[model samples]
Target: GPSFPEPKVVRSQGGLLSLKLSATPTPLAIAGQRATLLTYGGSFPGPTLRVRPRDTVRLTLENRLPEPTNLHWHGLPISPKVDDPFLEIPPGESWTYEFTVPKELAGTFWYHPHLHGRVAPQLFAGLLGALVVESSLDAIPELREAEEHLLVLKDLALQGGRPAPHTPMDWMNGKEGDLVLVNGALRPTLVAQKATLRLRLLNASNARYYRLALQDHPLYLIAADGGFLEEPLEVSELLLAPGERAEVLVRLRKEGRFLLQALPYDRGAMGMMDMGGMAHAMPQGPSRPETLLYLIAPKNPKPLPLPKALSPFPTLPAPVVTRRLVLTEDMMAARFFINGQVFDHRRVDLKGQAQTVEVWEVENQGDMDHPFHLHVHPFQVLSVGGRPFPYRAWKDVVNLKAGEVARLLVPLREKGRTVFHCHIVEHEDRGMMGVLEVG
Candidate 1:
């Protein structure tokens, strides 16, 4: 995280949202020692943007940041795509977003700088935000306002507490961080009442998988990256990959302080290059806690118990076509690619019609775990390594194990072309990405 002296949230009376995005050369202590780096708006993980669904958000983004930048509205249902044609707001320039939220979007989405070739460096310095879409039905039986909160989790690579540059090898396999943050703070606490609360959790890291669970209580999953689930799915821990989102319903039945845990995910037995000795090799010092958030004891709370069942989930038919893509990395060149191809901004790879299902298989042959994410629409994780995910969790991004296969059932109901790539910013910029077209 870079030293950003000023990071403020401002909302004007005219319904305009203005935020500063600045970049400067800074030093970052990564792997172990301090190194020079670059950053966005001056901080790592950037700023948080809070807005409701259906709100026409007019945002004026000032790119005081040192390099060329383009903001991509991830998961939003927008026309021409947010990054279509001209999305770049070059250095010292400002771009206005007359964003109109769709009435149907619920759950968590996000925004990040999408400058090809420089995604890693910028994101490593904190150029991202959380997008919350409020729904009229958020106050349903499954979730209560008295208990819910929004959480965005991320990891940063720093030198002298500021952004740093990645070594050639570090960028090739995607660098994992030693320091973690939630909403720009470390292990933050949220107070709640003795009621069922909903937590919209997002994994905003460049490359890291989180095995999230409560310190003592069981978690009921209410929704995924898209919206509410048909029924709540109970799990001891929820595994989240980069760019993925999840909504969990937590019951504060026993009023006691609790720690939100986020253990690093295992990349499997075979040593993958990028992930080899990841957790163990991480800088060992005072910064070795796997926990991500904190839960304060509920005080004299409401009497809403956790619901055993939630609203019925919507399911569409299987897709008529399917595509299998492979993930690869180049050790020497310090680059990454998808299906043996680097990202070509000008190339349109796959195209489909509206309301069509496309089975997308992301195979990880590289050493690191890649969180595969698709913009605009979410998908169902049909299976991993040929084994089906429990109850078929709906996700906008699926984490792939090293030398493993992640199968997804995608419905191209949304029109226009969107990005499908590894959520690791560096990997994405170096060419581990492609575009999908829907008509």
Candidate 2:
């Protein structure tokens, strides 16, 4: 395992957690050597904050960088009045975010720079961290007896010893890094003591998608972005897109080294209208399988019983209204759009009444896949590609392949303005986003 500065852990005390995080340039041992990257709390990956539902979290972000920034918590469905991308903290200034965690929300969540033009570069320079909300499953004996690990995945590509700048091609295809980081470290290694191992993996990359699988081992998926499922879903491989998470359980085999590998996946065509009025395809990012982590287990580990049932999902009422949004891109201008318009803070693209359920039909009309993400409230996937979604899971970010149409059952229970955009932050910054007003 490579040596890198580990993120600190901060747990809530007395039902509240108050802390100040400063973003500045810090030296991180990555990219094969010591490299300076923007970091929070002076670490490559910021501290991990732990809290329970209904807890108050007060976070003040002091910007020591040379530009502006703001933090957005993914998977937080409740309206955080002060944490939207519209709120900016200029260089050398500070802004505080106060919000109450919903009692109904739990699982693996994350925070990252949401400032409009800087999201791609800022996040690529390493400005993010994990936030784990305790669920009812945490107190259960099955999970208590298992060995848990949280993996924060990121990617970085540099040029001339500095973070690489995006090219026109990158803008259209979304930027992807060549070097990958697991908790900000490359090829991290650890030992799994218990027979049952719980791994919560969060993909915090800008445009990368991970098709993760353990070599020759089956993974039992216990949770999605929202939280644990009714039962574990076994799979040979799992796809985790930008701004998404998956919690998988593994029952250790014989004492030996096991590798968590990112399997090869083709997101979609990188084809575009050629420069000379011709059409062609251009390769953009790495899609080859790569090792992320190495885990060692005892020869004979103590096996714990797997939970037969987990947290049940909420029942949403039938939708009263339905909306449709199409995603498209203009390779000529290097801009993406929701409905032929860029994101305007003053423009309310969609309006709905509070406490009402709406059916949102999202279609990806572009050449590449875009992970559609909605803020403030999560939606359930009703169908994909016009086919019914196999299972139900509340998801804040869901992927739609090129030329794919999907239906989402969105419950607008919060009274505030939030957003739905391409989770690939680059696309979001480039106009592939829309604002939602609920009242």
Candidate 3:
């Protein structure tokens, strides 16, 4: 793959920015047979929105689907009290989103249909897009001199050659599709100069976590959800839960055939397997842990080498008070929830001042893992199961392993209402969410 074209900016002003929300089915000839497929904007993953921080976003959402539809700024910080805090454009109608570039430290955010009942169907129909946040600051000086790329990873379940129907089970466990896509392309192949290239990776799945790693070299993690880390952390793999974002700098110094992979996390195999022997001995399911993307080193590469040290991530002291949140699952109902409560967008659960540091203990009592994502601010993972986390990545979203408890230090700096919920789209729609107020 050749270097990606520089990202161009799209502005939304005077209510000029507009996008459609609809389902269109197409017929394709595969193996001498015509098959029908459904898509959004005529593509599998949809379109891309490239913008810098601080710019205004004025998007008119037209609902062309048969049902009511809405769009949620997945990782953006916005006041949730406002009706359609994001935008709930009704079916056959249009609504305009008039908001400035998100205030949260930007990296890669996303947009998807948020209608309570229709989210699953709409997302599978291809109602999702990549939102990139550019920073000229080059928080990591090393990345300043290197090239960069954006990878939006996702899985899709197709039926009749189109997005498949949502099952009770699919909606229950958050949907996981068979096909994985990067950006809107499938099985992306990257052709890059043998120079450093910053890769901003996002897991846009409904209910899946990717343990990402490279075949040749270890990835240098530069930033987490809220932005730059204090320093680059080298790791064999970084677990990316749904809605979470990570910025990694990989030096293609001598890249020959570096393979980008998404492997399975330990929790991904609960309902299907009753483990007895070594973890590796468990039966492998249909889901392939690693989804490969090619990274090709160019012939004429830059002489730039990987930076020894990167970025200054200022870390504040831990919060004085800590709260606990327990994630649980309902066996009978086959539903996932936090603190034994389901999501009701109209209801507000917690409230606090705009600038307050409070610790939240998220305990996963459910059989399935949940990616906890808050709307307005990012939190630091103080510890996982009481063990210190060497890399306290700043993230608006974090993963809660099944039966594990996670303590987080969250600083509510923005004044407004926001949502804290499971990032798995289907789980969220099915009520594994709650709202918080910061004022």
Candidate 4:
């Protein structure tokens, strides 16, 4: 049964807006339990903030919880000196953040707490939200007339209808929840018109990766991470990792009952079984697939045509510098590291000049998959696992499977210190991160 409330929408005014957010404990209904959880703006999944490129955002966050926390605009290229993840707001204190959204960033983005060790626990307890930067979708008559919906996918661990206790294995394997939620609802259903609808899918889970698909329908992908793709690509399934976002145009086509499901994914050789020393005993297999949403369409609904084009994503110039980063883990010490060292706030691991082009080669030496993320700059994927990417798009997060390598072209736009890390909250908190100094 689903008893979740609708998330409130906050729209910007004239490319400028102000907001006041408070982190506090609130009673939320989950899986038929009145569980007390930490949240922002008194709601789980917080609020959907709508803004445009070049918009000036002013927000004041007051930490009312007993722990320290800070907000990180997941895919935005804002400076660290203003509102980067490295800026922490202490408990019972308030911090004001003012930053201008880059003129080039316009797509589905999100915000969540980024306070190192506490990120996993706080986010799993529910403190995340969606941020949308307006783009050319508003000008396309076919998309403009369709209903827009934000689908935030999350999972929670539960035992006896309450939040589950964590174990040592949970930390090592990255906690996987038993309950799947869409916008805080359990097995929810969405009512849609018999026309094309714009759906913004955000994977806000701590560690879960989603192989999302709609039964008997296809998803026309329009944008990814930081901004629009070069063109829309139609596919039967879309893979989204933590801290990733995708915008797709869905045509109902006289739909009766369509189910949105999370298909079973293969996490390779280093998934759950390998971590707990159970690999020899447990059979290598995929997890069960689960239905996430039920879509209902009424009779004689209007049909909307798809746009021939979405948005133009330009290619980056030649790189002025190239750097290499390696990801590794130490099971004995139970720690993760980047470039053979843990994160140090006092240390700057990489450096570059402002407004310069750089190429980053990130290799995953570990046996599992990890999603790489960087702040203050959105990059373009040049190659994956030594093969060239077929398409061009702006992205802040890229998925790297076991023994995989990714080459990215990054444009450093501003002067400041920022951080890059694995987007898996647990891995990030465990020190799989590094700092970048741009000047």
Best by TM-score: 2
Identify the superior model by TM-score, candidate 2 or candidate 4: 2
Residue-by-residue lDDT tens digits, candidate 4, 322-404:
99999997643458889999999889999899888999999999866789999978899889899897667888899998799
Sort all candidates by lDDT, best to worst. 2, 4, 1, 3
Task: Report the lDDT tens digits of candidate 2 across residue range 321-425.
Answer: 989999998765768899778999889999899989999999999877889999888888889888896666778888988899989999987788888899888
The candidate 1 region of ten consecutive residues with least summed lDDT is 279-288
Give the best candidate by lDDT: 2
lDDT values for all models? 0.69, 0.84, 0.68, 0.82
Worst 10-residue stretch by lDDT in candidate 4?
277-286
| Poorly placed runs, candidate 4 (over 4 Å) | 1-6, 159-162, 268-285, 300-302
**lDDT score, residue 415, model 1?**
85
Tens-digit lDDT track of model 1 for 1-439: 3221112333333433545555555454333446554544444445456566656677667776667887777766676455452367788887777766776667777777777777777766666776777666676654644455667677866665565568765566566676776765656666664467777787777766678878887888878887767677888888887778888877665677788887655642121234755532222112234877667666654546555655555677867997988988775575778878887877888888888888888899987677888877667787888888776445777778678898888877568877788887667877788978888
Scored against the true structure, residue 199 in model 2 reaches a CA lDDT of 87
Model 3 misplacement above 4 A: 1-44, 81-87, 102-104, 139-141, 253-255, 269-287, 300-303, 307-311, 314-321
What's the true lDDT of residue 148 in model 4?
80
Candidate 3 per-residue lDDT over residues 175-247, each given as its tens digit: 7766676664556678775467788887777776788878877888877876767667888888888878888
Clashes of each: 13, 1, 4, 0
